[PDB]
Symmetry: D2
Subunit: 104 residues, 4 copies
């Protein structure tokens, strides 16, 4: 894809195995990748939601799982869910607006 | 052995006679009516509470899709289980949301 | 309203004192001992049978991880529900495996 | 990654919405992408397992979900799980051998 492509919405999580680090310490480096990426996101208890260009988002996830390894994880189980609607795109707001009090 | 868990789930219905958002709305209604703490996300809905109670919520959400007209449903679930202390939404997200300042 | 479903699940344990493969082995043992048709895959294990029976299998597999030494477990589940006819493993895979010739 | 990188094992599924096609017809085009890719795979009832290079496998998944759209899907929900162990790699056989009668 490129910056013109219609948006996707995605969620992902990383579950690391680390011999000498606490899980939360390793996960914090994965979330840092998300925080530093520039894309709209929201961290949830089980999954982090992303919105933006497909290839940009997949690269965020790849770098997030690598951040876990760089932080001391020997391995990572990474889960991804993608809502793909390339014709007109899909957004966080269209999926959650009915269900959150912050929306009018 | 705490049965307090955090769980996320989603339902992806097939419904020939319905727009999928309307079907999913009835699944979300089960969650809304349950009494448990929850948050609807773009890809999955997060729940907090007793394992068995939450599993029943998900089962009924799946059934609600069929009752709303779905021919079939693909239901995804993820559970964080930690019986030593239980697991909560706030423990997992406090570092990562502005609302926790 | 057939409750015959196909389900996949996985358990990803944290266990400071154990190699994770050994912990997961005890979860797979619950599946092996259940009596339901199953197949272990690299990323998830597939089950076929009654919805409630299968959910109980997964719950006990998750518990087996803790009993084997896991401090916590992330359990993933996916259910294909189609009460008009039920859903089976063979209906989903027959086109795609050589063993079905 | 490149062809030298240690292997990953991955599973994925596509759940399409198609206004004028049966789900199985659309999914068959996604599995065709897997079949035509050259990588080791196994189709399961809920997920298809892949083994090989990370970027090659992610490209297979991207093309699989696009095949659904080309086949008439208006949108697709795509799920991915990755076992990432870049040091020494991870294989299908190491995870399933104890649990299948075909292994000695």
């Amino acid at each position: 894809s490129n910056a013109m492509s219609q948006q996707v919405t995605m969620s992902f999580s990383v579950v690391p195995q680390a011999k000498t680090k606490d899980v939360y310490s390793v996960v914090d480096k994965a979330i840092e990748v998300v925080q530093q990426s520039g894309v709209r996101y929201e961290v949830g208890a089980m999954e982090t939601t992303l919105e933006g260009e497909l290839d940009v988002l997949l690269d965020v996830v790849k770098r997030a799982q690598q951040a876990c390894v760089d932080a001391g994880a020997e391995e990572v189980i990474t889960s991804i869910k993608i809502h793909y609607r390339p014709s007109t795109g899909v957004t966080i707001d269209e999926k959650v607006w009915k269900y959150r009090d912050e929306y009018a």
